[PDB]
Amino acid sequence: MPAKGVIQEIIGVVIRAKFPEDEVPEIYNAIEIPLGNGDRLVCEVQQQLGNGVVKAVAMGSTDGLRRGLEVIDTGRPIAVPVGPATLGRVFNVLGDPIDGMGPIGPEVERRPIHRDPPSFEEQNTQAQIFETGIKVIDLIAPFTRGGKTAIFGGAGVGKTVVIQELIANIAKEQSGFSVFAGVGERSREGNDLIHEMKEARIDENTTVFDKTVMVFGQMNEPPGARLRVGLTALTMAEYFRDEGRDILLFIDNIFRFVQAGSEVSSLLGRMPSQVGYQPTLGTEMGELQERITSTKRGSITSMQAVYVPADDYTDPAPATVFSHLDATISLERSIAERAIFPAVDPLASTSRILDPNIVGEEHYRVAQEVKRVLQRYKDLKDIIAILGMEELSDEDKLTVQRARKIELFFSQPFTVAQQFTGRPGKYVPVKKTVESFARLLNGEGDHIPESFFYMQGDFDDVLAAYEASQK
Amino acid sequence: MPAKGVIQEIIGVVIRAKFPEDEVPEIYNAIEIPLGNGDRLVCEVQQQLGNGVVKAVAMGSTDGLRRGLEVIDTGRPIAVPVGPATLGRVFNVLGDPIDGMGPIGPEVERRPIHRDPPSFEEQNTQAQIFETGIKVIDLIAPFTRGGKTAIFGGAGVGKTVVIQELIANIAKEQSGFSVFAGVGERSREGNDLIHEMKEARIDENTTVFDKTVMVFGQMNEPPGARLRVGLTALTMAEYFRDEGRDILLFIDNIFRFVQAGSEVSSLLGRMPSQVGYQPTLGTEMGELQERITSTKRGSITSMQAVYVPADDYTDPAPATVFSHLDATISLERSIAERAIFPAVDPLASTSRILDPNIVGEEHYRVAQEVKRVLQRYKDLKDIIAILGMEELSDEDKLTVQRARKIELFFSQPFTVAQQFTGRPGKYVPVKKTVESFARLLNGEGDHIPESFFYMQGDFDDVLAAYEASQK
Amino acid sequence: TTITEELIARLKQGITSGVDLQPRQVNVGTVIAVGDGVARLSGLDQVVASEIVEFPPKAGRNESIYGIALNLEQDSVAAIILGDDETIEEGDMVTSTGRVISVPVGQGLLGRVVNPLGQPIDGKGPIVYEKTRPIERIAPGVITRKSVDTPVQTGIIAIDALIPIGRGQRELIIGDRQTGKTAVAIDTILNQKGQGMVCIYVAIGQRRAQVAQVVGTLERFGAMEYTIVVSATASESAALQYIAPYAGCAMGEEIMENGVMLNGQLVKDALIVYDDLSKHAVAYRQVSLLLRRPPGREAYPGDVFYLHSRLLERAARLNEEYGGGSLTALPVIETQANDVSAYIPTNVISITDGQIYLESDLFNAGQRPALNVGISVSRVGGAAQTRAMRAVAGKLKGELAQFRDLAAFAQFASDLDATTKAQIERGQRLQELLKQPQYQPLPVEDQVAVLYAATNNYLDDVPVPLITKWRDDFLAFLRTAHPEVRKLIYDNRLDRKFPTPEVKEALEAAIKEFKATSNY
Amino acid sequence: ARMVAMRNATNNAKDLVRDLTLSFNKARQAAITKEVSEIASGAAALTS
Ligand SMILES: Nc1ncnc2c1ncn2[C@@H]1O[C@H](COP(=O)(O)OP(=O)(O)OP(=O)(O)O)[C@@H](O)[C@H]1O
Ligand SMILES: Nc1ncnc2c1ncn2[C@@H]1O[C@H](COP(=O)(O)OP(=O)(O)O)[C@@H](O)[C@H]1O
Ligand SMILES: [Mg+2]
Ligand SMILES: [Mg+2]
């Protein structure tokens, strides 16, 4: 479809292009406006308003465009490069590398942004745990293969730190790739800091950055770009999924994807729905998070970060996000103030895979009893702070001691990210977490003071440090 | 008569009139519709729709109009009389005298309603305190010369009475003139109860009415009249500002101006903003307020009453005026029902001019200490509600007594309040009120009971009352 | 030869054969409709989006009022009038200037109050310049930036110790009504007297009197030697208020990319304050609704998150490859009854790196900077602090968090045990320490010394209502009796182990000497 | 007795805060929905 049209209307980041009566571009067909030299503006067709007129979102500056400019139809949605050539590179919404390196090249396979999800036959009937290395994540709210996990928290609780240490864990300890979709990524927070963090984490002769793809829909971009960056990262990850690999896509803020969709719908003149949101919120979430599944060939596990507006979990954006979630990891500022870097609240982190018949019979006894002990501590904390531990009877003093031990034991140094409290790499497996927490839950740790459990290992590091200090 | 057109549409108080294409009226022009009684209907243009068609706000009944009526363009915006001829008269939005006196002659100067505000380099940054006759206004929230000051309260708290009392005080005890803008003026508050209350003799044969200008954009007027009455009063006061005189401007209500703007915008078919309000709310408020400034030549100093429904200060009407204020007087119904008729709350009544570098160190010290003791009493009255004052007090008895004495001493009998009470009015200079509060603050009033502070002038009046009782 | 011969040699080239006297069919537009600051033009097909149009002078109007062609609809150009809408009439000629909006930039704008178009409004003569920078440009990008390391010293102890602001960091100041947002911004501007940083103040939608008072405050403290004051007041059209912050940040990006000679030193660091982004968003909402663009939540247009983001993502910290300069943004947001979850507040909070929350409850309680430490964050953190402040303020942060956990027990402290009462008293003394008078910023050495005195057990003797006075007196002591202690603290403020025994012993001796010779 | 009664009162106050926060979230969502619906009705009745 080499059809050439002309720009008819320009209203903000929403343009209209008049084409011939035949060969009109389809919906999501990525028209392109040359701007001189090699620069071009890639718009995405959203509506067909009659005789050859298509309404599209700019996905670019569109601040120097005149009416009547030539527009080239591409005949397909936005084409982004896929393959090993995308590893170690940073892309915008259009798949153009926004790092210092040059273009990808014409010999690299390009794929459309808008694909269909895996069919009904391709879905995996039986779920499977995804080991991630983190103690609290693998124990309390375990991941699922081809599933969605959402991390919550405040502005500075450490969600991005958790995301990047998970990227490092996936890249270094196992030979697996990951794709990071920085939707609404600040040009300071992610466009240099995350690159430095990924290029600082090194295993041998290569970095964690070398085993991950990055697609940055920065905040300065128009709402269409921040809307389509998630699908761009999905397209770049589905290649490795088609090779049978287990990709773990990360999403910087799925709420900013929702807000980009709402802004795009408002700019197109559509009637608002719910709390001023787009009418197509459910379908827009489905077209993204139904491509994150466990195919019979390969799998895409995903980890989103969700911003909850006004701490309202019944808000339509968290309501629609929660419909697709398989696990939740709640970060609390209170835990962060106690110098706990993995500030995961085990009493607020859930997972659908936490079942006796999937993650193990001992898993859904150790996790259940750990949660019960922590709930007992949460109940008794006010009494302890007001009165003191002397009022607590037996079976409650021991419970509080074990609860403090596990609460301080959930902390990890994230030695892969920088070298803060650096120590030999552990990457504690799921079975090791189960065995350590069953060990402490069955006593065997009461002689340890409640200060050794800090950035520790697998409860064998705890006893090793106890023997080293004084034994 | 630059142009003559015909009425095309009459929709309520909106007139669409078709003019010759080479003689279309300007944006803020005034167009007269001659009626079959020797009078005319003056509409204000607001838009130029297409080829020679203009949309105008009626500023009249439009219950005698038919399609095809002749419409004479005046070429310029609404022209209102200025000069000494307007002094002592009552006008409306069109500048026509609505009192029983004769019409204004054609020899007077007539100025357009819409004028640019004074430029940035004409601003006089020298802050000067304007002497009001009110004790609490002088002490707590001093009146700034050339600045804009607001009164906030519910219904019946005393805003209009306070405004007319300042008119009487600053015209009698000072030579400053006054211009009154009855925006949305009730026909009971404006047609009576202010004309009669301005029949207060100044020296021998001149009343406050003879030295003041009144422009009543009454409530039964269409929304355009109530929208432009404030600008009419500003145009009338700007002549006295340009003569070098320090002119006083009282806008009897601000939220009615906002309501008139909202109604005008809704009637014109403009897109609604915020909660159904006008999109040009900030611009209209700025256009009104920025003409009230202190210049090198003269200074318009203004007091504007604002009615907050319930206690909602986040409504668009008080929120859009907060940026334009130099001082706020917060009237309270609780203080009014306690027979403290000048029901100013000393707390939550701020002023930018309340600075030791401007009003002096003694004024600042006295005001700050009075606010401190009143704040202490705000808790001590609760404390003594159950535990009697005689039961226990560590200097609490003395500070409670002093605070009760000063909160009664803030009450002042008004000249215009003789109808309500019969007590003759009192005027206190700004020096005498701060001196009296300094004297009462540290001793010298602990023996006089809290009955001789009720309705008095300076502390000398309280003393004279005390030794008049003890005869 | 004479220099006038060189002057004539410059002439007689364009004078003789340098002018093209060719008449060409230039495409102009005719006005078909004028609204409320929006004028629609019939045919102007040679216009780009956001291009400044002229409206050339006509009969009865000797000046041209420019506009911004925003809506390039089919056979229609809706342009928002920058000046006054009264003069524009139907049928008026409109000539396309062929240029996007640009503002003068460079050394000449230093101490000048200017329009968003760059025209001076201070009445101090024309702006001297040789370069114009475009209003709208893309942010520096991905590889251009650098991690924020250099601190911006606001002078407020609470901000500089708990909510660090670094060069290239977008730190929102969000408050409500009169809580001191402009006071905090002006205090930050006044503290850059010799810090090698050029300040810019935008003041969108304010009073002319308020901007005049701000300029007077700046020029009475000598701050106008390095400050640019853009101004789009409330009476001015919504187009000027819409383009004001972009003009300010264009000047800031000129400072960042090239730099100016300040005090004989090249300065490439700029601190910009958008004193009302809520008012800027209101002005753009008025522009969009008057253009009949489809509204969204709270009647704001769809591209209102985009609006501010273009503005705020231009504040960067460039690496040494791209000059090493930086632009620091200090947006100001006014909430309504502390409605943090409103549209524009959430937009700016998500965009900005950190937030500074000002509460009316603290402002009316005597806290002179009404700063809410509990909810306000700076995600750059310790990287935006000196090593001295990093070493000292950690215990301050911990003690203040402990006090905020126990703030409900403050009036009951006389009835509690020893450790809880001690924590409450320490928190009260620290909160009284953070109170600062207006227009009195403190240098980093003074803040470090005061916070070291407070962090260690030295303010326990002096009672709470005198803490502030103590601080003032101590500073006077350090300003008179021991300048060497202040110089020593300032000299090794970048040392990784800041409390070296030399500076530690000097500071302890100064504190002991002050305490022994003073009574409270 | 006062300690136990005030602990129970604090727990009940926290529960009431949770219920009131749910009610406030419902009210805020309904208010924003009403506002956007009114704005859309007032805009679509005059444009298209
Ligand atoms: N630290 C302070 N100590 C004492 N007074 C202060 C302090 N900061 C501000 N003020 C006082 O409070 C007033 C209001 O502060 P300011 O004007 O900075 O607030 P704002 O949030 O910008 O308000 P506005 O909405 O009026 O623009 C100042 O004029 C000043 O008199
Ligand atoms: N100084 C005063 N002395 C006595 N009564 C007063 C005084 N000021 C107000 N009032 C009471 O308030 C009423 C007028 O209130 P008004 O100022 O018209 O209300 P608003 O403040 O809403 O305009 C009168 O009926 C009177 O009883
Ligand atoms: Mg009234
Ligand atoms: Mg301010």
PDB file of C-alpha atoms in Angstrom, chain C residues 77-237:
ATOM      1  CA  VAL C  77      -7.031  28.332  10.835  1.00  0.00           C
ATOM      2  CA  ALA C  78      -8.042  29.007  14.432  1.00  0.00           C
ATOM      3  CA  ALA C  79      -5.344  31.136  16.069  1.00  0.00           C
ATOM      4  CA  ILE C  80      -5.313  32.304  19.680  1.00  0.00           C
ATOM      5  CA  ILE C  81      -4.671  36.032  20.009  1.00  0.00           C
ATOM      6  CA  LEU C  82      -1.573  36.900  22.029  1.00  0.00           C
ATOM      7  CA  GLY C  83      -2.589  40.525  22.552  1.00  0.00           C
ATOM      8  CA  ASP C  84      -6.077  41.986  22.942  1.00  0.00           C
ATOM      9  CA  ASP C  85      -9.014  40.549  21.001  1.00  0.00           C
ATOM     10  CA  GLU C  86     -10.959  43.827  20.726  1.00  0.00           C
ATOM     11  CA  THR C  87      -8.914  45.228  17.837  1.00  0.00           C
ATOM     12  CA  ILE C  88      -9.078  42.158  15.569  1.00  0.00           C
ATOM     13  CA  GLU C  89     -12.088  42.414  13.259  1.00  0.00           C
ATOM     14  CA  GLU C  90     -13.682  40.260  10.583  1.00  0.00           C
ATOM     15  CA  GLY C  91     -12.037  40.616   7.185  1.00  0.00           C
ATOM     16  CA  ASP C  92      -8.659  41.673   8.579  1.00  0.00           C
ATOM     17  CA  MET C  93      -5.547  40.614   6.701  1.00  0.00           C
ATOM     18  CA  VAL C  94      -3.320  38.018   8.374  1.00  0.00           C
ATOM     19  CA  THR C  95       0.221  37.360   7.150  1.00  0.00           C
ATOM     20  CA  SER C  96       2.073  34.165   8.019  1.00  0.00           C
ATOM     21  CA  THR C  97       5.437  35.073   9.525  1.00  0.00           C
ATOM     22  CA  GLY C  98       6.962  31.717   8.577  1.00  0.00           C
ATOM     23  CA  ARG C  99       8.455  31.341  12.061  1.00  0.00           C
ATOM     24  CA  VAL C 100       7.643  29.430  15.215  1.00  0.00           C
ATOM     25  CA  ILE C 101       7.651  31.494  18.403  1.00  0.00           C
ATOM     26  CA  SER C 102      11.177  32.334  19.548  1.00  0.00           C
ATOM     27  CA  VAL C 103      12.500  34.361  22.466  1.00  0.00           C
ATOM     28  CA  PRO C 104      15.740  36.344  22.865  1.00  0.00           C
ATOM     29  CA  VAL C 105      18.278  34.432  24.941  1.00  0.00           C
ATOM     30  CA  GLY C 106      21.701  35.091  26.394  1.00  0.00           C
ATOM     31  CA  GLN C 107      23.464  37.415  28.797  1.00  0.00           C
ATOM     32  CA  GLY C 108      21.238  40.383  27.949  1.00  0.00           C
ATOM     33  CA  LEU C 109      18.325  38.840  29.860  1.00  0.00           C
ATOM     34  CA  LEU C 110      19.711  39.173  33.383  1.00  0.00           C
ATOM     35  CA  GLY C 111      17.777  41.438  35.717  1.00  0.00           C
ATOM     36  CA  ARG C 112      15.106  42.159  33.100  1.00  0.00           C
ATOM     37  CA  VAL C 113      11.376  41.553  33.458  1.00  0.00           C
ATOM     38  CA  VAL C 114      10.097  40.356  30.089  1.00  0.00           C
ATOM     39  CA  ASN C 115       6.958  39.195  28.334  1.00  0.00           C
ATOM     40  CA  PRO C 116       6.628  35.552  27.276  1.00  0.00           C
ATOM     41  CA  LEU C 117       7.505  36.922  23.820  1.00  0.00           C
ATOM     42  CA  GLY C 118      10.748  38.357  25.220  1.00  0.00           C
ATOM     43  CA  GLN C 119       9.653  41.997  25.068  1.00  0.00           C
ATOM     44  CA  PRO C 120      10.712  43.891  28.218  1.00  0.00           C
ATOM     45  CA  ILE C 121       8.043  45.193  30.584  1.00  0.00           C
ATOM     46  CA  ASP C 122      10.401  46.644  33.186  1.00  0.00           C
ATOM     47  CA  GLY C 123      10.876  49.855  31.193  1.00  0.00           C
ATOM     48  CA  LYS C 124      14.680  49.612  31.309  1.00  0.00           C
ATOM     49  CA  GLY C 125      15.315  49.808  27.569  1.00  0.00           C
ATOM     50  CA  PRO C 126      15.358  47.188  24.824  1.00  0.00           C
ATOM     51  CA  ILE C 127      16.712  43.719  25.477  1.00  0.00           C
ATOM     52  CA  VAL C 128      20.229  43.377  24.087  1.00  0.00           C
ATOM     53  CA  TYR C 129      20.676  40.014  22.390  1.00  0.00           C
ATOM     54  CA  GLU C 130      22.082  38.251  19.354  1.00  0.00           C
ATOM     55  CA  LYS C 131      20.455  34.794  19.552  1.00  0.00           C
ATOM     56  CA  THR C 132      16.823  33.689  19.680  1.00  0.00           C
ATOM     57  CA  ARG C 133      15.878  30.257  20.948  1.00  0.00           C
ATOM     58  CA  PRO C 134      12.645  28.526  19.876  1.00  0.00           C
ATOM     59  CA  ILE C 135       9.799  28.226  22.360  1.00  0.00           C
ATOM     60  CA  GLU C 136       9.204  24.501  21.841  1.00  0.00           C
ATOM     61  CA  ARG C 137      11.963  21.917  21.499  1.00  0.00           C
ATOM     62  CA  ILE C 138      12.525  18.259  22.277  1.00  0.00           C
ATOM     63  CA  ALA C 139      14.075  17.286  25.600  1.00  0.00           C
ATOM     64  CA  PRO C 140      17.822  16.481  25.608  1.00  0.00           C
ATOM     65  CA  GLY C 141      16.983  12.772  25.504  1.00  0.00           C
ATOM     66  CA  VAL C 142      18.456   9.495  26.704  1.00  0.00           C
ATOM     67  CA  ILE C 143      22.237   9.549  26.286  1.00  0.00           C
ATOM     68  CA  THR C 144      22.454  13.323  26.746  1.00  0.00           C
ATOM     69  CA  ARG C 145      21.721  13.350  30.474  1.00  0.00           C
ATOM     70  CA  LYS C 146      23.786  12.511  33.557  1.00  0.00           C
ATOM     71  CA  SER C 147      23.009  11.365  37.085  1.00  0.00           C
ATOM     72  CA  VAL C 148      22.164  14.236  39.427  1.00  0.00           C
ATOM     73  CA  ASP C 149      25.065  14.826  41.808  1.00  0.00           C
ATOM     74  CA  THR C 150      25.505  18.561  42.427  1.00  0.00           C
ATOM     75  CA  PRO C 151      23.139  19.919  45.107  1.00  0.00           C
ATOM     76  CA  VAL C 152      20.915  22.978  44.842  1.00  0.00           C
ATOM     77  CA  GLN C 153      21.100  24.748  48.206  1.00  0.00           C
ATOM     78  CA  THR C 154      17.691  26.289  48.858  1.00  0.00           C
ATOM     79  CA  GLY C 155      18.780  27.648  52.243  1.00  0.00           C
ATOM     80  CA  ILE C 156      15.876  26.022  54.089  1.00  0.00           C
ATOM     81  CA  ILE C 157      17.178  23.512  56.633  1.00  0.00           C
ATOM     82  CA  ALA C 158      14.207  21.175  56.206  1.00  0.00           C
ATOM     83  CA  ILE C 159      14.386  21.124  52.400  1.00  0.00           C
ATOM     84  CA  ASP C 160      18.180  20.940  52.163  1.00  0.00           C
ATOM     85  CA  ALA C 161      18.340  18.207  54.829  1.00  0.00           C
ATOM     86  CA  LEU C 162      15.264  16.036  54.186  1.00  0.00           C
ATOM     87  CA  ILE C 163      14.100  16.740  50.611  1.00  0.00           C
ATOM     88  CA  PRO C 164      17.329  17.310  48.646  1.00  0.00           C
ATOM     89  CA  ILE C 165      17.140  19.180  45.348  1.00  0.00           C
ATOM     90  CA  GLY C 166      19.933  18.668  42.833  1.00  0.00           C
ATOM     91  CA  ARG C 167      20.969  20.400  39.642  1.00  0.00           C
ATOM     92  CA  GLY C 168      18.800  18.945  36.897  1.00  0.00           C
ATOM     93  CA  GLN C 169      16.052  17.681  39.220  1.00  0.00           C
ATOM     94  CA  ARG C 170      12.394  18.605  38.761  1.00  0.00           C
ATOM     95  CA  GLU C 171      11.159  19.254  42.309  1.00  0.00           C
ATOM     96  CA  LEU C 172       7.504  20.237  42.555  1.00  0.00           C
ATOM     97  CA  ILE C 173       6.378  22.663  45.258  1.00  0.00           C
ATOM     98  CA  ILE C 174       2.737  21.760  45.900  1.00  0.00           C
ATOM     99  CA  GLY C 175       0.570  23.575  48.403  1.00  0.00           C
ATOM    100  CA  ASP C 176      -2.712  25.347  48.994  1.00  0.00           C
ATOM    101  CA  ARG C 177      -3.684  29.048  49.123  1.00  0.00           C
ATOM    102  CA  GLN C 178      -1.074  30.873  51.293  1.00  0.00           C
ATOM    103  CA  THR C 179       1.435  28.304  52.537  1.00  0.00           C
ATOM    104  CA  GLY C 180       4.652  29.900  51.284  1.00  0.00           C
ATOM    105  CA  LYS C 181       5.221  28.255  47.904  1.00  0.00           C
ATOM    106  CA  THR C 182       6.358  31.560  46.412  1.00  0.00           C
ATOM    107  CA  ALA C 183       8.235  32.184  49.665  1.00  0.00           C
ATOM    108  CA  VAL C 184      10.093  28.875  49.284  1.00  0.00           C
ATOM    109  CA  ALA C 185      10.860  29.604  45.625  1.00  0.00           C
ATOM    110  CA  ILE C 186      12.122  33.115  46.401  1.00  0.00           C
ATOM    111  CA  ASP C 187      14.230  31.794  49.285  1.00  0.00           C
ATOM    112  CA  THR C 188      15.756  29.236  46.915  1.00  0.00           C
ATOM    113  CA  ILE C 189      16.467  31.977  44.363  1.00  0.00           C
ATOM    114  CA  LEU C 190      18.059  34.278  46.962  1.00  0.00           C
ATOM    115  CA  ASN C 191      20.406  31.509  48.133  1.00  0.00           C
ATOM    116  CA  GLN C 192      22.177  31.331  44.737  1.00  0.00           C
ATOM    117  CA  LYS C 193      24.014  34.620  45.296  1.00  0.00           C
ATOM    118  CA  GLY C 194      27.442  33.075  44.753  1.00  0.00           C
ATOM    119  CA  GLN C 195      26.562  29.490  43.844  1.00  0.00           C
ATOM    120  CA  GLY C 196      27.156  29.963  40.111  1.00  0.00           C
ATOM    121  CA  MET C 197      23.540  29.388  39.101  1.00  0.00           C
ATOM    122  CA  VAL C 198      21.188  31.576  37.054  1.00  0.00           C
ATOM    123  CA  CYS C 199      17.601  31.782  38.298  1.00  0.00           C
ATOM    124  CA  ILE C 200      14.452  32.224  36.205  1.00  0.00           C
ATOM    125  CA  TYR C 201      10.998  33.126  37.543  1.00  0.00           C
ATOM    126  CA  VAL C 202       7.975  32.708  35.281  1.00  0.00           C
ATOM    127  CA  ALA C 203       4.908  33.798  37.325  1.00  0.00           C
ATOM    128  CA  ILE C 204       2.077  32.501  35.151  1.00  0.00           C
ATOM    129  CA  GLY C 205      -1.278  34.163  35.750  1.00  0.00           C
ATOM    130  CA  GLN C 206      -0.329  36.285  38.760  1.00  0.00           C
ATOM    131  CA  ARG C 207      -1.064  39.892  39.655  1.00  0.00           C
ATOM    132  CA  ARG C 208       1.024  42.704  38.251  1.00  0.00           C
ATOM    133  CA  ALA C 209       1.370  43.914  41.844  1.00  0.00           C
ATOM    134  CA  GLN C 210       2.492  40.472  43.036  1.00  0.00           C
ATOM    135  CA  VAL C 211       5.136  40.183  40.310  1.00  0.00           C
ATOM    136  CA  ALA C 212       6.231  43.753  41.065  1.00  0.00           C
ATOM    137  CA  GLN C 213       6.627  42.871  44.749  1.00  0.00           C
ATOM    138  CA  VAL C 214       8.583  39.725  43.842  1.00  0.00           C
ATOM    139  CA  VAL C 215      10.889  41.743  41.574  1.00  0.00           C
ATOM    140  CA  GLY C 216      11.347  44.350  44.302  1.00  0.00           C
ATOM    141  CA  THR C 217      12.234  41.638  46.812  1.00  0.00           C
ATOM    142  CA  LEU C 218      14.735  40.155  44.356  1.00  0.00           C
ATOM    143  CA  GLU C 219      16.356  43.507  43.543  1.00  0.00           C
ATOM    144  CA  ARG C 220      16.522  44.630  47.175  1.00  0.00           C
ATOM    145  CA  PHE C 221      18.604  41.523  47.951  1.00  0.00           C
ATOM    146  CA  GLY C 222      20.829  41.768  44.872  1.00  0.00           C
ATOM    147  CA  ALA C 223      19.264  38.678  43.301  1.00  0.00           C
ATOM    148  CA  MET C 224      18.475  40.395  39.990  1.00  0.00           C
ATOM    149  CA  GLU C 225      22.174  40.256  39.069  1.00  0.00           C
ATOM    150  CA  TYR C 226      21.493  36.641  38.027  1.00  0.00           C
ATOM    151  CA  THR C 227      17.685  36.371  37.743  1.00  0.00           C
ATOM    152  CA  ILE C 228      15.341  36.494  34.748  1.00  0.00           C
ATOM    153  CA  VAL C 229      11.703  37.315  35.488  1.00  0.00           C
ATOM    154  CA  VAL C 230       9.286  36.220  32.793  1.00  0.00           C
ATOM    155  CA  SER C 231       5.781  37.524  33.466  1.00  0.00           C
ATOM    156  CA  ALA C 232       2.358  36.632  32.065  1.00  0.00           C
ATOM    157  CA  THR C 233      -0.040  38.356  34.441  1.00  0.00           C
ATOM    158  CA  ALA C 234      -3.723  37.650  35.049  1.00  0.00           C
ATOM    159  CA  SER C 235      -5.034  40.422  32.788  1.00  0.00           C
ATOM    160  CA  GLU C 236      -2.909  39.253  29.857  1.00  0.00           C
ATOM    161  CA  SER C 237      -4.403  36.873  27.319  1.00  0.00           C
TER     162      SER C 237
END
